[PDB]
Subunit: 124 residues, 6 copies
């Protein structure tokens, strides 16, 4: 999470992760209940690309996480071809820039692509 | 939530949302138990228009949320024709002004319209 | 609640309200268990007249709350005829003065009348 | 409780009271489990005479509380005839001095008499 | 517990004691699960000799506590004959020195003897 | 845990340990659920070599802990022959350097070897 007590990253807290997992204990990845829960968790904790990586591993199986990671990679290259806000194309990979706590605007764009990447899942 | 530790907005906390949802787990949107719970949550967290948007999505299904959003839109235009306190008609849409943490008086007026918009629901 | 970290009012916290309600989940309004619980809650949170209004609505049904509000109104007029401590009769209605965080002495008197107003209930 | 963040009294917190009650939910007043629990609560919260009064009312029925209050009154007069530490016999009733957060030594003596007063109970 | 926010002692917190007891709810004194739990509690709270006295009373029956207290008394005299670190033999009883928050090194030695004293128990 | 409020070590908190254990209550050491949980706990608490020692003892039986400790000892000597980052070969044993809160880079390397040492377990 990118804390806001100068943007500062702080690792996931197990008590926060446990609250998220139990809210989606009966929700397949991509389902409406799933998306609603992770959308609020993204809003609350303002996670970096690395944090979102960790959150996906914690909540979904390898097959699902593997597929989401792939879908997002395509979403990123599509978005880059399609135009992104706050994206300095000379500042390195989008995933690396989304780990810079300063680039909040970019990070928020990355979060939406990460959330959208779940669309490739049946949701059931 | 508009925190009061200069009015400052801070996103919804999942632990707060979870406490609200479980209090209305057996209460249809608009029912007496529902309204009592969200009235106290509005009082405690002083939510902005955007926060109230998020809270509605979290607690109600799309059909209910869609209808509430519509009812409130009519309530807003009715209230604007009917006279509102703290409303600068030149300062943009009421929903935008209700997101300015400074305009507390207006925000409180918006919260009551948001709460009243549940009246269009059978409550059962 | 009138917080004591200059007397400052802060709204009810849902986690505090939920703890009170579950302690009286099996206690009719006015019963010994009910009174014992709200007496300690009044002591802990030092609520204003408005706070006590909200607490009554949250814990009791409309019929009970309606009757308590009435009983207290008579208790207030009786107490005013009967003599009250810290009551400036020129400073407005007792209920308004009991919302001024400065008038702690008066507020404590109001709390006892609010607690006593439950006597009109069978307690079962 | 007499807090130690100059000795300062702060009222009982419902979350603390609830933890005490549930630890003795299956323990009659005066039983070994009862005494063990309240002895640690007295140690943790350093309660005044008034606090101990409130704690007794919260945990025991009127018949038990009535009897404990009586037993302690005799224990106090016995202790006064028998010699007490920190007791200024000219400074008012022992119960009043035990409410002065400054008189910690005396307060601790009062707590032990309050705890001992449970001996008049069968403990079962 | 000897807090480390100058070494300062603060009494046991009931919420901490309750967490310890429920971890060993199904573990006889001296069993592997018992020792593992209290070893971590000693590490976390850095208890004094008096604190360890209180913890033993809270977790074990009188027969067990009586025997542990005895075993430790022999362990102390054995350790004193056997050589101890941080032990000023002229500074009073080991138990008294282990209550001085300054003598951390000694206190840690006392904790290990207190833990070892459980060896006289069958553990089942 | 190496806290980050100058790197400072603070002992394990029982409430944190209890949350970890209950997340792996139905997960054999080395299983996917086990590794996922301890990987996030290592990330959150940044434990030293001594902390990881304690965590292993708390979560696994002696046979498992004994084997893990052995496997890691071989992993350490293998890694030392194989090249390590932040490792000053003249500054003492890797385990000792991994207890120095300053040597964060080294500590992170040690954590990964500690995590990898679970590979010798069947995971079921």
């Amino acid at each position: 999470p990118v804390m806001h007590p100068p943007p500062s990253h702080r690792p996931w807290q197990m008590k926060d992760l446990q609250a998220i997992k139990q809210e989606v204990s009966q929700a397949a990845p991509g389902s409406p209940q799933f998306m609603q829960t992770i959308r609020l968790a993204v809003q609350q904790f303002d996670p970096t690309a690395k944090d979102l990586q960790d959150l996906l591993q914690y909540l979904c199986s390898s097959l699902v996480a593997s597929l989401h990671h792939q879908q997002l990679d395509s979403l990123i290259s599509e978005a880059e071809t399609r135009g992104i806000t706050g994206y300095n194309p000379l500042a390195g990979p989008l995933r690396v820039q989304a780990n810079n706590p300063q680039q909040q605007g970019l990070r928020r764009e990355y979060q939406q692509l990460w959330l959208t990447a779940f669309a490739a899942l049946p949701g059931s």
